[PDB]
């Protein structure tokens, strides 16, 4: 069952350029509205020496507003839940691999997240912390070999005006057999609404809505 | 830029080293973001590859831009603009294309070059197993004083599933224009009729610019 | 600081498609001959559900024969040691990210390794365990922004015949300031010499030699 | 075939939309893996891009093959072979090229097409900041009954550092020939002389096949 008001609990363990860190979060969202927010706390490896923005899209497509005409792969997967894997290939060769194992306990989603980024150059916008925010995005979702894929090419706006491109490849895997959707889209907008100076505390929001594009 | 505009084009190209040429005439409504055209294979027919790889090469002036997004393309006329594009398919087939667009009265004139390589003999392009392009959402952003366009899209396949392609486009106005912020263009391109070997093709496209997840005030 | 005969001790912690595992190894090698061998034992997450081959090039370029005329970035970095990071981008979309922090204790190199692979399709050669061996390879090494890079586009041989390609991007980072080499190459040949049925025990060998390619 | 062979080619192409044409004549020793040629720009000069992006497009028959490795290329004659290639530079510039190689007496005849797109205005190609290709080691392997070649190589830059490029080549014999095992070809290509705007270029290449890490002193 998925209620109008759900909660979120997560732990991320990870590393960037070989340097370990760990983050925990608690939050709330409205799955039928495609909106969520959460408060994140760095527990290990702080102060983080890399742009926090590379982490935020790893911190659940159940928080997406799906219209009746499009099959909802994610709300179907519960109570058993689903997992996802993702590669995030930035244009300067930095690459982040991430996984999230999502379970449900009562009215609370539980995330077990792993995050590993390598080859971020010392003078690039990530290690120099010169990212501003992710732009809004439109993810493309499609079935391949019985599971759901999501591809998007998006970008971070940089301090000073420019953009830093990143290519997302996600595989979504329900833990139980669910009915699969047709090719469709998910519009996203993720935003850090508040943070302290070294990002030990972050309030993170996301809004997402599925659609089928131009008719 | 009038409410009703005409299109005239010629494409010269090659796929896997085998040359061909296509000419087209069409019409469209630039402010409604809609256009259609009839295309004729002039050389190299019958084409031995999936026609679909050509269709997104057969003009973002035909995109409905809201007042609230700066229109790079309508600004560039009468002088016009040019674009370059690489289309990177997931099985390694790669197509490079260019279009130099000028304006003659109410008619846009395209001079197009198209070169595709490394399409495997047993793949969906050389075996014409494509059905259509899905609708897409392109991302547009400024780099080095010109406009770029990236989109990861896909062709639907004859037996199910999809065949992915990554587009990288560079748009270059021929005169100085005002650059627009990061935005999107939704597309849907469709073959609306064709004869058996695709020597004749009726092609339509609909495109609308927008700024992503924000209208519903009723 | 670099003896003709050196030993190896390592622990790898990692995950493939979200399923964690851990492996430890002990070995020995001859840095000036560019040869090494090691025994690896599955400690957690066995029996491994993926092709063991994707791990082996993560199980140290100090074990490469460098001529006098090519600066040896790796033997220079000791006793302080060096670290490396790597992406391994397979042609079907599977991606493995790995890091190795290498230290030296007496005559023993100590590796702390992390390995994370995602998006390997269920019907692909990795999850179906259809790999035979890595082919011999030639890595290209060059300086960028004060550190050393290594790129190579190798392949794994498959059972029914054919090859499964992988693009390697490695960054090597000495822990101290060392002299930087010119553009050069390292030939590799890595081989699993013995293993038990589910690869809980693996004997792994590699041979490597640096060179500067066809002369000018 | 012969220990001494001649070469005559013509390349037609475009970079970032702008068209050009080059012709060349040369000679080489296929069993020694060495060749040289003189190239002349016939159209589109002075070339506004780094000449180096063209040179590896200007024939693996000029590679020294040991007896233990099957020679796909020397087998394909007199009928010849063709190849297609995509050259993917690290800043997004991409070049697609094809070469149809035939044999006329003792002269190889190349018909070459070259199309590069998305080279940024401030990058090393459009600013002519390349020095030379480094030596390389190509990996060759059979796929789909034809021969493939992959190599990740680099151009050295005029201010230091390197500019990377990933080559993907498909080699297609025109007749049925014997297929080789996975192997390598070492390359070293060099511009030995040129005039100021590269309308005239003397180009050399040396190439040798081998099987990777294998001097018994005799």
What can you tell me about this protein's structure?
The PDB classes it as fluorescent protein. The entry lists the keywords Dronpa2, fluorescent protein. The assembly is tetrameric. The structure is a homotetramer. In chain A, a hairpin with a 4-residue loop joins strand 2 (19-30) and strand 3 (35-44). The first copy, chain A, is mostly beta strands and 215 residues long. The first copy, chain A, has a single domain (1-215), classed as Green Fluorescent Protein (Beta Barrel), CATH 2.40.155.10. The first copy, chain A, has an 11-stranded mixed barrel. Chain A has helices at 53-56, 73-76, and strands spanning 6-16, 19-30, 35-44, 82-90, 95-105, 108-118, 131-134, 137-144, 147-158, 163-174, 184-195, 201-211.
Looking at this protein, list some descriptive labels.
215 residues, homotetramer, mainly beta, 57% strand, Green Fluorescent Protein, 11-stranded mixed β-barrel
